[PDB]
Amino acid sequence: MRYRPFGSTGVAVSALTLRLADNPRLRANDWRALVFTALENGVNSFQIDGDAPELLKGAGEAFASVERHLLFLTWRLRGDAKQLGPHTLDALKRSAFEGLSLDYLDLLLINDPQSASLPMAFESGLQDLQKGRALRGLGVASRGDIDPGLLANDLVTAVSSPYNLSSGWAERHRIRQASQNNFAVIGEDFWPQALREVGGYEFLTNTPGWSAEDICLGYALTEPSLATVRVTADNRQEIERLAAVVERDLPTGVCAQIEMARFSAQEREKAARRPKLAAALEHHHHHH
Numbered sequence: 703m704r705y706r707p708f709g710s711t712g713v714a715v716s717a718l719t720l721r722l723a724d725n726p727r728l729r730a731n732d733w734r735a736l737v738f739t740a741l742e743n744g745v746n747s748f749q750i751d752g753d754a755p756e757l758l759k760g761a762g763e764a765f766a767s768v769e770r771h772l773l774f775l776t777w778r779l780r781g782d783a784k785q786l787g788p789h790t791l792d793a794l795k796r797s798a799f800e801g802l803s804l805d806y807l808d809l810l811l812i813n814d815p816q817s818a819s820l821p822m823a824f825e826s827g828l829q830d831l832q833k834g835r836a837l838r839g840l841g842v843a844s845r846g847d848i849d850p851g852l853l854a855n856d857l858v859t860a861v862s863s864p865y866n867l868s869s870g871w872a873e874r875h876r877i878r879q880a881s882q883n884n885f886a887v888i889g890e891d892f893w894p895q896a897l898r899e900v901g902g903y904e905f906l907t908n909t910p911g912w913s914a915e916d917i918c919l920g921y922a923l924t925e926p927s928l929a930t931v932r933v934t935a936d937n938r939q940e941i942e943r944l945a946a947v948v949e950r951d952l953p954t955g956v957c958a959q960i961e962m963a964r965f966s967a968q969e970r971e972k973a974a975r976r977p978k979l980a981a982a983l984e985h986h987h988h989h990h
């Protein structure tokens with residue numbers, strides 16, 4: 703495992719962040735041993751993206767067993783960002799703080815309200831946790847441009863964003879600016895939908911020694927703008943195979959094909975417009 707500085711917060715996170723997403727097929731001991739495999743493989747950044755009794759139980763017991771200051775725990779708070787109020791912090795106390803048995807969260811990661819401002823009730827409560835030494839940072843996950851006003855907020859110490867193989871220099875630049883303005887950037891969807899099925903993406907499955915989950919995670923990890931790539935793991939063999947990818951070097955053949963293929967793709971993604979004015983062909987013409 704490799705570790706990167708979380709932007710300016712002064713704490714180190716593993717290059718991978720394992721996301722515990724509610725899953726009806728894992729009992730508490732299953733979640734416990736998941737988190738254990740993660741720690742044993744050097745992963746110290748978790749994201750809790752669920753509130754199931756069995757998950758908080760097992761994740762809480764595992765987190766509980768190592769020293770709290772080795773761990774970076776992100777709580778993923780979904781729903782419309784502009785509906786968050788007192789109720790949300792009642793939910794947060796019971797799920798994040800009692801449920802996992804933490805005294806502080808390293809980060810709370812909300813949806814983008816596409817808005818200069820959060821709700822009054824919520825923002826107040828967050829500064830209350832803040833002073834209570836009980837929430838290190840706020841974070842805003844977003845697909846477009848977070849509002850410069852919201853980024854100005856002093857609670858806001860991080861963003862998360864889809865960055866992957868497919869991403870545009872469009873998408874990329876934003877993640878880079880964020881990094882320069884001292885925001886920590888969390889990488890998401892590293893293996894995309896488009897590819898779950900001149901250049902073309904055949905090399906993704908033909909590369910001797912590499913899988914596509916693996917090649918794709920490969921690329922995500924080469925972006926310095928990203929403080930950590932988010933991964934998600936049904937199980938133990940997966941966490942093992944992805945923590946391995948961090949120590950491997952993408953073969954420079956694959957890196958070149960990753961870029962031809964990307965051009966190729968977004969070329970035909972712009973043969974799909976089709977503006978038909980059967981004009982511009984022979985006919986005297988204009989008065990100038």
Ligand SMILES: Nc1nc2c(ncn2[C@@H]2O[C@H](COP(=O)(O)OP(=O)(O)O)[C@@H](OP(=O)(O)OP(=O)(O)O)[C@H]2O)c(=O)[nH]1
Nearest residue numbers: 780781782783813814815816843844845846862863864890
């Ligand atoms: N990175 C990331 N961002 C998230 C996630 N969930 C919500 N967001 C952010 O919140 C904005 C609005 O999301 P919500 O309205 O809460 O729910 P939605 O994600 O289903 O739209 C999103 O813009 P948008 O939804 O892309 O635009 P629009 O077409 O909804 O206007 C996106 O920037 C997530 O899992 N990851």
